[PDB]
Design a protein around this ligand. Structure first.
Ligand SMILES: CCCc1ccccc1N
Ligand SMILES: [Cl-]
Ligand SMILES: [Cl-]
Length: 162
């Protein structure tokens, strides 16, 4: 297992514009297009990201390309963050995938305010961090996914992704 496979599992793959769990226009492998509710803004955003007139539809390769860029951006966002960086570097490889997942789904912002969890993870208090992480709107809105990420942080194995 690796980050791409993991995220492909959590986000799925859709080649036509769709609405995410929060009702926002998205495409491909969880690639957010816009928070606005105007489909047209969304199509404009898609065309600009792809570089051609898509008319709301993309190819598999195009999707995968956005996905590459997006995984990369996420990691790089983590590395640039002062609160995040030190934590991330303290983790092993599996757990780092779980960190990237979260940032991919919620932004560096969202994650940057999980202060108490940050600390617990840095101290390697797995079970404690796991409980703390579940006390969140993130877990409450997307429990199945949050469960898999939390298990991942908790155990350092790919079991939740089976
Ligand atoms: C709870 C925050 C977990 C975390 C630590 C380091 C980098 C990214 C993320 N998501
Ligand atoms: Cl792009
Ligand atoms: Cl879910």
């Amino acid at each position: 297992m690796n980050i791409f496979e993991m995220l492909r599992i959590d986000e799925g793959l859709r080649l036509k514009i769709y609405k995410d769990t929060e009702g926002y226009y998205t495409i491909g492998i969880g690639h957010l297009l816009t928070k606005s509710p105007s489909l047209n803004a969304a199509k404009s955003e898609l065309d600009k990201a792809i570089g051609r007139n898509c008319n709301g539809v993309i190819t598999k390769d195009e999707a995968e390309k956005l996905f590459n860029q997006d995984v990369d951006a996420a990691v790089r966002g983590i590395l640039r963050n002062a609160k995040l960086k030190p934590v991330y570097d303290s983790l092993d490889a599996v757990r780092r995938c779980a960190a990237i997942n979260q940032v991919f789904q919620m932004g560096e912002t969202g994650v940057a305010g999980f202060t108490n969890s940050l600390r617990m993870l840095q101290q390697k208090r797995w079970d404690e961090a796991a409980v703390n992480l579940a006390k969140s709107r993130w877990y409450n809105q997307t429990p199945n996914r949050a469960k898999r990420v939390i298990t991942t942080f908790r155990t350092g194995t790919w079991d939740a992704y089976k």
